[PDB]
Design a protein around this nucleic acid. Structure first.
Length: 70
DNA sequence: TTACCTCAGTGCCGGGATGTGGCT
């Protein structure tokens, strides 16, 4: 089903490393993809963690995004 | 406009004076 897979391929455009909408769903615009900052000895942060991505956009997609973003 | 999607002491006080240490 090229249509089902096409709808799934489209979700890739909004995979991100950092989520600009987290505290408030009203924020509108582009995604953010950045490598973790250099480690600071006195601070707990993403600097000590491996690279991972997530997904946010329409409520409807949830299932269709799972093929490539898992 | 709509559909979607989450697990005998003592204590101050004045005042003139003895003596001293640094500069020339």
């Amino acid at each position: 089903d090229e249509g089902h897979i096409t709808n799934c391929l489209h979700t890739v455009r909004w995979l991100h490393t950092h989520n600009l909408k987290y505290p408030d769903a009203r924020v509108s615009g582009e995604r953010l993809i950045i490598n973790a900052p250099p480690l600071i000895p006195g601070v707990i942060s993403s600097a000590g963690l491996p690279m991972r991505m997530g997904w946010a956009h329409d409520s409807s997609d949830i299932n269709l995004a799972k093929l490539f973003g898992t």
